[PDB]
Design an enzyme around this catalytic site. Structure first.
Site, PDB file in Angstrom:
ATOM      1  N   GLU A  35       0.818  -1.203   0.000  1.00 52.99           N
ATOM      2  CA  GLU A  35       0.000   0.000   0.000  1.00 52.99           C
ATOM      3  C   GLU A  35       0.856   1.259   0.000  1.00 52.99           C
ATOM      4  O   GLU A  35       0.534   2.228  -0.696  1.00 52.99           O
ATOM      5  CB  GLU A  35      -0.910   0.012   1.226  1.00 52.99           C
ATOM      6  CG  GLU A  35      -2.019  -1.015   1.209  1.00 52.99           C
ATOM      7  CD  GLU A  35      -3.053  -0.806   0.126  1.00 52.99           C
ATOM      8  OE1 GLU A  35      -2.971   0.174  -0.649  1.00 52.99           O
ATOM      9  OE2 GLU A  35      -3.959  -1.662   0.064  1.00 52.99           O
ATOM     10  N   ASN A  46      -7.920   8.506  -5.640  1.00 53.99           N
ATOM     11  CA  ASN A  46      -8.697   7.467  -6.296  1.00 53.99           C
ATOM     12  C   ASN A  46      -9.538   8.072  -7.412  1.00 53.99           C
ATOM     13  O   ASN A  46      -9.831   9.268  -7.425  1.00 53.99           O
ATOM     14  CB  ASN A  46      -9.606   6.744  -5.297  1.00 53.99           C
ATOM     15  CG  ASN A  46      -8.838   6.173  -4.112  1.00 53.99           C
ATOM     16  OD1 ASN A  46      -9.154   6.465  -2.953  1.00 53.99           O
ATOM     17  ND2 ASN A  46      -7.809   5.386  -4.395  1.00 53.99           N
ATOM     18  N   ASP A  48     -12.587   7.831  -7.982  1.00 50.93           N
ATOM     19  CA  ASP A  48     -13.847   8.349  -7.461  1.00 50.93           C
ATOM     20  C   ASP A  48     -13.711   9.686  -6.745  1.00 50.93           C
ATOM     21  O   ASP A  48     -14.725  10.228  -6.293  1.00 50.93           O
ATOM     22  CB  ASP A  48     -14.558   7.289  -6.603  1.00 50.93           C
ATOM     23  CG  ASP A  48     -14.009   7.204  -5.179  1.00 50.93           C
ATOM     24  OD1 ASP A  48     -12.952   7.800  -4.894  1.00 50.93           O
ATOM     25  OD2 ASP A  48     -14.624   6.518  -4.335  1.00 50.93           O
ATOM     26  N   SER A  50     -12.045  10.285  -3.934  1.00 50.19           N
ATOM     27  CA  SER A  50     -11.520  10.084  -2.596  1.00 50.19           C
ATOM     28  C   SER A  50     -10.002   9.962  -2.657  1.00 50.19           C
ATOM     29  O   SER A  50      -9.404   9.890  -3.732  1.00 50.19           O
ATOM     30  CB  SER A  50     -12.137   8.839  -1.960  1.00 50.19           C
ATOM     31  OG  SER A  50     -11.739   7.668  -2.642  1.00 50.19           O
ATOM     32  N   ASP A  52      -6.523   8.040  -0.523  1.00 50.51           N
ATOM     33  CA  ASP A  52      -6.039   7.031   0.410  1.00 50.51           C
ATOM     34  C   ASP A  52      -4.845   7.621   1.153  1.00 50.51           C
ATOM     35  O   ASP A  52      -3.986   8.261   0.537  1.00 50.51           O
ATOM     36  CB  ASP A  52      -5.526   5.820  -0.361  1.00 50.51           C
ATOM     37  CG  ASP A  52      -6.634   4.952  -0.920  1.00 50.51           C
ATOM     38  OD1 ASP A  52      -7.820   5.145  -0.587  1.00 50.51           O
ATOM     39  OD2 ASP A  52      -6.303   4.035  -1.691  1.00 50.51           O
ATOM     40  N   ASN A  59      -8.978   5.043   3.048  1.00 55.47           N
ATOM     41  CA  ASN A  59      -9.633   5.938   2.110  1.00 55.47           C
ATOM     42  C   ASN A  59     -10.596   6.884   2.813  1.00 55.47           C
ATOM     43  O   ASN A  59     -11.198   6.562   3.841  1.00 55.47           O
ATOM     44  CB  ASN A  59     -10.366   5.167   1.010  1.00 55.47           C
ATOM     45  CG  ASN A  59     -11.629   4.522   1.506  1.00 55.47           C
ATOM     46  OD1 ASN A  59     -12.618   5.198   1.793  1.00 55.47           O
ATOM     47  ND2 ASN A  59     -11.609   3.205   1.609  1.00 55.47           N
ATOM     48  N   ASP A 101     -15.227  -4.757   9.374  1.00 50.41           N
ATOM     49  CA  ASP A 101     -16.404  -4.251   8.675  1.00 50.41           C
ATOM     50  C   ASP A 101     -17.184  -5.336   7.939  1.00 50.41           C
ATOM     51  O   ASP A 101     -18.323  -5.079   7.530  1.00 50.41           O
ATOM     52  CB  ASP A 101     -15.966  -3.165   7.684  1.00 50.41           C
ATOM     53  CG  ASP A 101     -17.130  -2.419   7.059  1.00 50.41           C
ATOM     54  OD1 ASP A 101     -17.998  -1.924   7.805  1.00 50.41           O
ATOM     55  OD2 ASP A 101     -17.176  -2.333   5.814  1.00 50.41           O
TER      56      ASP A 101
END
Ligand SMILES: [Cl-]
Ligand SMILES: [Cl-]
Ligand code: NA
Length: 129
Positions: A35, A46, A48, A50, A52, A59, A101
Site C-alpha cells: 500500500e 482514487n 472516485d 476520494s 487514500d 480511504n 467491517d
C-alpha cells in the site's frame, strides 16, 4: 516516516494488530508494503475523487475526513491527516475498524491481490518481536 520492515512489524504488534481478527502480523506488514512501501506520508487519489492516506492507504470515502470527498463518511472519526503521522496509532485504530467491517482484509484490494494466499510470514522473518 519510512519504517523499516521489522520496525513496522514491532510497532504493529505493540498496537495490537498481531492476529487481530485472525490476521497474522505478516499479513499487516505485507499490506503496508504494497500500500505505502512503509511510508506513513503516502497519499494517493482514487478515480472516485476520494484519497487514500498513510501506511495502510485508508480511504476518505468511508473512514476519515479530508474535507474534499463529497458524500463521504468519517467512520474512524479522524482527519485523514492523522493517518500520515510518524505515530501509527491512528492508522492502526482505523484499520481495526476497517478489518472488522465484514470482508476482513479484502477491504485492502492490494492485500487481496498481493498478500492473500502467499507466505506472509516472510514479512516478519528475522525480526526481533
Ligand atoms: Cl505472519
Ligand atoms: Cl476474516
Ligand atoms: Na470522508
Amino acid at each position: 516516516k519510512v519504517f523499516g520492515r521489522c520496525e513496522l512489524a514491532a510497532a504493529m504488534k505493540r498496537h495490537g494488530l498481531d492476529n487481530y481478527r485472525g490476521y497474522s502480523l505478516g499479513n499487516w506488514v505485507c499490506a503496508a508494503k504494497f500500500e505505502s512501501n512503509f511510508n506513513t506520508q503516502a497519499t494517493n487519489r482514487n478515480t472516485d475523487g476520494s484519497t487514500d492516506y498513510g501506511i495502510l492507504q485508508i480511504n476518505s470515502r468511508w473512514w476519515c475526513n479530508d474535507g474534499r470527498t463529497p458524500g463521504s463518511r468519517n467512520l474512524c472519526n479522524i482527519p485523514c491527516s492523522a493517518l500520515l503521522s510518524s505515530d501509527i496509532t491512528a492508522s492502526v485504530n482505523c484499520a481495526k475498524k476497517i478489518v472488522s467491517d465484514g470482508n476482513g482484509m479484502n477491504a485492502w484490494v492490494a492485500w487481496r491481490n498481493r498478500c492473500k494466499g502467499t507466505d506472509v510470514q516472510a514479512w516478519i522473518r528475522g525480526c526481533r518481536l
